[PDB]
Design a protein around this ligand. Structure first.
Ligand SMILES: O=c1ccn([C@H]2C[C@H](O)[C@@H](COP(=O)(O)NP(=O)(O)OP(=O)(O)O)O2)c(=O)[nH]1
Ligand SMILES: [Cl-]
Ligand SMILES: [Mg+2]
Ligand SMILES: [Mg+2]
Ligand code: NA
Length: 330
DNA sequence: CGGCAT
DNA sequence: CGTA
DNA sequence: GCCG
């Protein structure tokens, strides 16, 4: 064989695709690699999973893997076992292990990463109740993640997004006339549910957006909408008290402010997917010698930044065919 | 061998 | 360390 | 784990 470029940013990956079972097994091994501190193995298994998402058809025979980037002996054996038996022993052993289940439980708490989760695991902790019993071990961020864990485990729906965008737009418009709010993250790629809602805020006049995020946060807090926030800043990782009929639920909301000169770069970065953006930044540095992030695209030889008005401008400058957000689901 | 996004 |  |  199939046409398959080596970088995920070089091929469309739609929201709905084939090979979900194969990819899900490889993503288990990727997650497990991360839990053991092997970020390189995590990347390869993520990349191999992503290749299967971009293929035109279901993989039914091992021969359909011939020539594909990021498939070597290990990833191919996993697919082979799934095709020949419907299960992969290594994947089942990982999935059912106490280590994997506990690390997954702890790292899905807001404020907990692999290193913290592993420290707790080595100390004998296994459940969220164990963590509540030892609050000396917890940052304020982790306390918020634990306190709202049940709600944060509930998928965020489009109806939630629409309600949240309205209250964010109200606060932004109170804080700075003419400022705008753009939905980014997974919902912009067409995802129907998510773990949070991500919003990008800017203003058409360069510089007007300075100091905006603290003013937005104060106005949301005054409406009773903020359960948790981190506190001059450009990114806010919040938990909102989202009104529901007769009640409310906690929802993670991320806010990012960019000057309008940087808006295309921030929109590109925050629309994702995470793997798509890692691969795009890798492509930029290795194939073009340019450094890419949410602020800009830097040429370290001329010592200049590329001026962009659109995401299309950035793809074109990197020599890449443009992909709309719904084809960035790597 | 070492990189693996910023 | 955590976060996007 | 895979590859530049
Ligand atoms: O490590 C990261 C995490 C996120 N990002 C970018 C891409 C990602 O799509 C976007 C928003 O991050 P989220 O964690 O909110 N992921 P997403 O919105 O894609 O999915 P969901 O929120 O449903 O998990 O920010 C990175 O660049 N690096
Ligand atoms: Cl960034
Ligand atoms: Mg998101
Ligand atoms: Mg987010
Ligand atoms: Na976490």
């Amino acid at each position: 064989p199939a046409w398959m470029p080596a970088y995920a940013c070089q091929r469309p990956t739609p929201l709905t695709h084939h090979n979900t079972g194969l990819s899900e097994a490889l993503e288990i091994l990727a997650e497990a690699a991360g839990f053991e501190g092997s970020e390189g193995r995590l990347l390869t298994f993520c990349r191999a999973a992503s290749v299967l998402k971009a293929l035109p058809s279901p993989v039914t025979t091992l021969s359909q893997l011939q020539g594909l980037p990021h498939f070597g002996e290990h990833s191919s054996r996993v697919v082979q076992e799934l095709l020949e038996h419907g299960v992969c022993e290594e994947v089942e052993r990982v999935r059912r292990s106490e280590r994997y289940q506990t690390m997954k439980l702890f790292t899905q708490i807001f404020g907990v990463g692999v290193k913290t989760a592993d420290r707790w695991y080595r100390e004998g902790l296994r459940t969220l109740d164990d963590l509540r019993e030892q609050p000396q071990k917890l940052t304020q961020q982790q306390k918020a993640g634990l306190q709202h864990h049940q709600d944060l485990s509930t998928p965020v729906l489009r109806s939630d997004v629409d309600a949240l965008q309205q209250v964010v737009e109200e606060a932004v418009g109170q804080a700075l006339p003419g400022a705008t709010v753009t939905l980014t993250g997974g919902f912009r790629r067409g995802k129907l549910q998510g773990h949070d809602v991500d919003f990008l805020i800017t203003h058409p006049k360069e510089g007007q957006e300075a100091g905006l995020l603290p003013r937005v946060m104060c106005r949301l807090q005054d409406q009773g909408l903020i359960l948790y926030h981190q506190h001059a800043f450009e990114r806010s990782f919040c938990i909102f008290r989202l009104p529901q009929p007769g009640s409310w639920k906690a929802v993670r909301v991320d806010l990012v402010v960019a000057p309008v000169s940087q808006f295309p770069f921030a929109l590109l970065g925050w629309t994702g997917s995470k793997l798509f953006q890692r691969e795009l930044r890798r492509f930029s540095r290795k194939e073009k010698g340019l450094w890419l992030n949410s602020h800009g695209l830097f040429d370290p030889e001329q010592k200049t930044f590329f001026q962009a008005a659109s995401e299309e401008d950035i793809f074109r400058h990197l020599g890449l065919e443009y992909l709309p957000p719904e084809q960035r689901n790597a």
